[PDB]
Design a protein around this nucleic acid. Structure first.
Ligand SMILES: [Mg+2]
Ligand SMILES: [Mg+2]
Ligand SMILES: [Mg+2]
Ligand SMILES: [Mg+2]
Ligand SMILES: [Mg+2]
Ligand SMILES: [Mg+2]
Ligand SMILES: [Mg+2]
Ligand SMILES: [Mg+2]
Ligand SMILES: [Mg+2]
Ligand SMILES: [Mg+2]
Ligand SMILES: [Mg+2]
Ligand SMILES: [Mg+2]
Ligand SMILES: [Mg+2]
Ligand SMILES: [Mg+2]
Ligand SMILES: [Mg+2]
Ligand SMILES: [Mg+2]
Ligand SMILES: [Mg+2]
Ligand SMILES: [Mg+2]
Ligand SMILES: [Mg+2]
Ligand SMILES: [Mg+2]
Ligand SMILES: [Mg+2]
Ligand SMILES: [Mg+2]
Ligand SMILES: [Mg+2]
Ligand SMILES: [Mg+2]
Ligand SMILES: [Mg+2]
Ligand SMILES: [Mg+2]
Ligand SMILES: [Mg+2]
Ligand SMILES: [Mg+2]
Ligand SMILES: [Mg+2]
Ligand SMILES: [Mg+2]
Ligand SMILES: [Mg+2]
Ligand SMILES: [Mg+2]
Ligand SMILES: [Mg+2]
Ligand SMILES: [Mg+2]
Ligand SMILES: [Mg+2]
Ligand SMILES: [Mg+2]
Ligand SMILES: [Mg+2]
Ligand SMILES: [Mg+2]
Ligand SMILES: [Mg+2]
Ligand SMILES: [Zn+2]
Lengths: 74, 110
RNA sequence: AGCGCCGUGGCGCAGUGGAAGCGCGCAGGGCUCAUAACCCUGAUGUCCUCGGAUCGAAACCGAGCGGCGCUACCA
RNA sequence: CUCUAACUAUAAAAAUCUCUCUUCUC
RNA sequence: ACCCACUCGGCACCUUACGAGAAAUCAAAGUCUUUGGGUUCUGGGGGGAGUAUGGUCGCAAGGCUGAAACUUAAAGGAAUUGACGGAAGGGCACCACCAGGAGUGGAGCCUGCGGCUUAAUUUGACCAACACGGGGAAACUCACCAGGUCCAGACACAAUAAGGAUUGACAGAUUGAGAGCUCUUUCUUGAUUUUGUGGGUGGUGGUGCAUGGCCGUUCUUAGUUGGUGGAGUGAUUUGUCUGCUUAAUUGCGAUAACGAACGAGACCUUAACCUACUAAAUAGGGUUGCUGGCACUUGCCGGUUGACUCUUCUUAGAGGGACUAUCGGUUUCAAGCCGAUGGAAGUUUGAGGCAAUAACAGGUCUGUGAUGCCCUUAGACGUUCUGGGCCGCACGCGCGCUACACUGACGGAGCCAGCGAGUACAACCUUGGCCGAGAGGUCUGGGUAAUCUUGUGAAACUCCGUCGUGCUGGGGAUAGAGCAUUGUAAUUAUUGCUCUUCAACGAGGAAUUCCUAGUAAGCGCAAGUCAUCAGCUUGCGUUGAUUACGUCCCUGCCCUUUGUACACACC
RNA sequence: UUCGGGUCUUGUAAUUGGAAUGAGUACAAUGUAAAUACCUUAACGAGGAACAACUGGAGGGCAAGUCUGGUGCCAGCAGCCG
């Protein structure tokens, strides 16, 4: 026979890391130059190719696609 | 011992069971004397000597002797008599002794 | 106070001149499907303390200690 | 269809036992 | 006084049912539902109870008469089948004994339980549990514990939602972690998802007292069963037995029994024997070559994958062989038993494999994607990762191992097997040559196997020496240090090796285990566990006995008879 | 020839229609000493015809459930066995 009790935890909780959703996120990446040319506020990643934007957190820029291999100090 | 054992339920709860407390009328008591006809005398921890029936699920399922802590259910219509419902095997009885649900003047130790 | 008795290992006893005893207890083991009965093995000392003789003392004796009983409170 | 024969002779002790009993129709 | 016949009366008796009974049985217990010859006494479920009371008799003891209150669903009669008997008859069993052998129980250790302890020391078994779950677990195993991950939540619907349902992450805090587990910031990803409902899966979670399957046991004994037929009202019984025989419900037989079925036997594997057959460079032998050595006579012991030839041994196919064969005893002279001879073999030739009806609340949900029900199904009892445990230790018990030494230990030398096994999508068995003292290391070469390890050149054993009755050169436990191997990882020593300390142990009480011939016992090897690890198990072979060849005394088993107030059956 | 018309009928459906009728009320009259009440009868009086039938039981005796949920030798049931 087995005599098991209700498990009591010495830990408050660990919560699922909810993904940070951002409304109107894409336009912040770019900048319209008055009905015509456009520029990109973020920096492009060389390894992946054109378009993918580097991530700036503090004194470095970081990629998303090849995220692991690219983190270059500013 | 004997060939009786194989006819039994084989209910093996050897591991440490969780002891059951007292609930609104169920109270702890101590076996004072053994009587006949499957009935016992229980000194309850209230200064009273109730007459407790050896009860179903307990008659020939556990064997109880003099000086055993016990849990017994009362009857509101007749207070003098009651029914033995559960038996504590001298280990959780020590725990209740430290927690002191019963007056500690009743010292029963091997 | 004297005299008679005694000195467990837990209790009742035995030999006391050659060195730890028995029984009843207690612990463990054995027989039995199981218990009791029965069987086996122990673990307990200052056989009360100080001395004499002695290869030997616990005895044998004496220089005392403590407890019981008869004389009986012995101005 | 005919008949009456063979024979022995051991006793030691041993007490007790708790649940629980469950349908048979083509 | 007998003998024969008859009769009356009496205690009785045998057979039988054609009559009676619930039957055991009764010649009355018959002439009773086809109920009536005369007549007296008694009983109306059991207990209370032949008790109290009231009479009456008695010296007394006690006798006669004699309820109720109350309680109870049975008590009781006969017989049937089992079980049991410290009841009987006849047979069996070294899980029984006699005569013995080797032991265990005493010691140390290894392992398995209980208990204690612990966060956990995961759990199931208590003859038929305990070196058992193939349970020799360092990770995994795993089932326990302290923690950390993930969904491996199908599908349907709703819901958000493509101006983001969502996913993932560098670096840092955090963490044991180089875990984007959680946070800091931000970047990436596209309808697979996310949060709710239903539902479904997963579970070494529970229930073997819900079950299957399997195995164990009753029970290694010889025991079961139904069809017609006979006896019983019937449950049941005969067939299934008085004897003798057998290991056997095996037969000879006698018979309300006749024919049959399962079991036993028969049957297969294996071990023998095959100078009879077929054959063999993956097995051996001879002759002869080509050589080596010693002898000198032409001979001895060798080497060669050179040739020819053969199958005695080694193999494995078809077959043969033994059926108690012959003979002598003994047997209602039948089944069969005993002895001798010939044989290879005469215990069923030895050893096994399957192995009947009925049953256990025997074990297993912890082998199964076998499984009903219950539980859980998101910080999970799912799965995975890290570390710990399953091995702790005041203690008891069960398998064993090494020992207590002279029939010995230690040195050399001799040198003998049979079962096996062995690498592929992986890395096995290892020869040989070099190193190291050893474990071991390295370089090569064989073997997917009668080819290579391998003739597994194994131990016990044998011969010659050292030791010399001293807990000693026995015993090698417990420890200290070092060297290696397997392993991601070895501390709580994995294991092997080297030096040292060398403990208890003086043949072990009560008690108890196994075993009658290549047997016990000693001795090791192989295989299963296996990356490394056995003191375990399954097999194999070496050396190889003492003592039976009987019995029912102990423990049980089979059949029959008997008794029972037992049938959850002598617990 | 699969059919299948249902060829010939009998039930089951909150579908659906037309009827009849009281139990009740009530002009009257009968009834009665006088009144009730009954018999008769105007006028009303049925659709869920709510104008609504209970009392016990469903293991056996003994006709009818090994359906669902609850309690778990509790509560209770059961004349007896259970
Ligand atoms: Mg069981
Ligand atoms: Mg009566
Ligand atoms: Mg009577
Ligand atoms: Mg009287
Ligand atoms: Mg009787
Ligand atoms: Mg025995
Ligand atoms: Mg003997
Ligand atoms: Mg031995
Ligand atoms: Mg021993
Ligand atoms: Mg021992
Ligand atoms: Mg343990
Ligand atoms: Mg047996
Ligand atoms: Mg291990
Ligand atoms: Mg783990
Ligand atoms: Mg583990
Ligand atoms: Mg964990
Ligand atoms: Mg599983
Ligand atoms: Mg079972
Ligand atoms: Mg059988
Ligand atoms: Mg018949
Ligand atoms: Mg019969
Ligand atoms: Mg041959
Ligand atoms: Mg003959
Ligand atoms: Mg045989
Ligand atoms: Mg399960
Ligand atoms: Mg799990
Ligand atoms: Mg273990
Ligand atoms: Mg064993
Ligand atoms: Mg030595
Ligand atoms: Mg060989
Ligand atoms: Mg020595
Ligand atoms: Mg093992
Ligand atoms: Mg014999
Ligand atoms: Mg009975
Ligand atoms: Mg008895
Ligand atoms: Mg009703
Ligand atoms: Mg009812
Ligand atoms: Mg009902
Ligand atoms: Mg009925
Ligand atoms: Zn990039």
């Amino acid at each position: 026979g087995k005599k098991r009790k209700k498990k009591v935890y010495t830990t408050p909780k660990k919560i699922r890391h909810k993904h940070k959703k951002v409304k109107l996120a894409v336009l912040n990446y770019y900048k319209v130059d008055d009905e015509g040319k456009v520029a990109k506020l973020r920096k492009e990643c060389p390894n992946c190719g054109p378009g993918i934007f580097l991530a700036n957190h503090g004194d470095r820029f970081y990629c998303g696609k090849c995220h692991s291999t690219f983190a270059t100090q500013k | 011992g004997g060939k009786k054992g194989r006819r039994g339920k084989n209910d093996s709860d050897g591991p440490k069971r969780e002891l059951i407390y007292k609930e609104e009328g169920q109270e702890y008591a101590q076996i004072t004397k053994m009587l006949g006809n499957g009935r016992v005398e229980a000194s309850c921890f209230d200064g009273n000597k109730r007459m407790a029936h050896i009860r179903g699920k307990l008659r020939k399922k556990v064997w109880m002797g003099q000086g055993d802590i016990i849990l017994v259910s009362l009857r509101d219509f007749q207070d003098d008599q009651c029914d033995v419902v559960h038996k504590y095997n001298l280990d959780e009885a020590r725990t209740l002794k430290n927690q002191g649900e019963l007056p500690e003047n009743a010292k029963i130790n091997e």
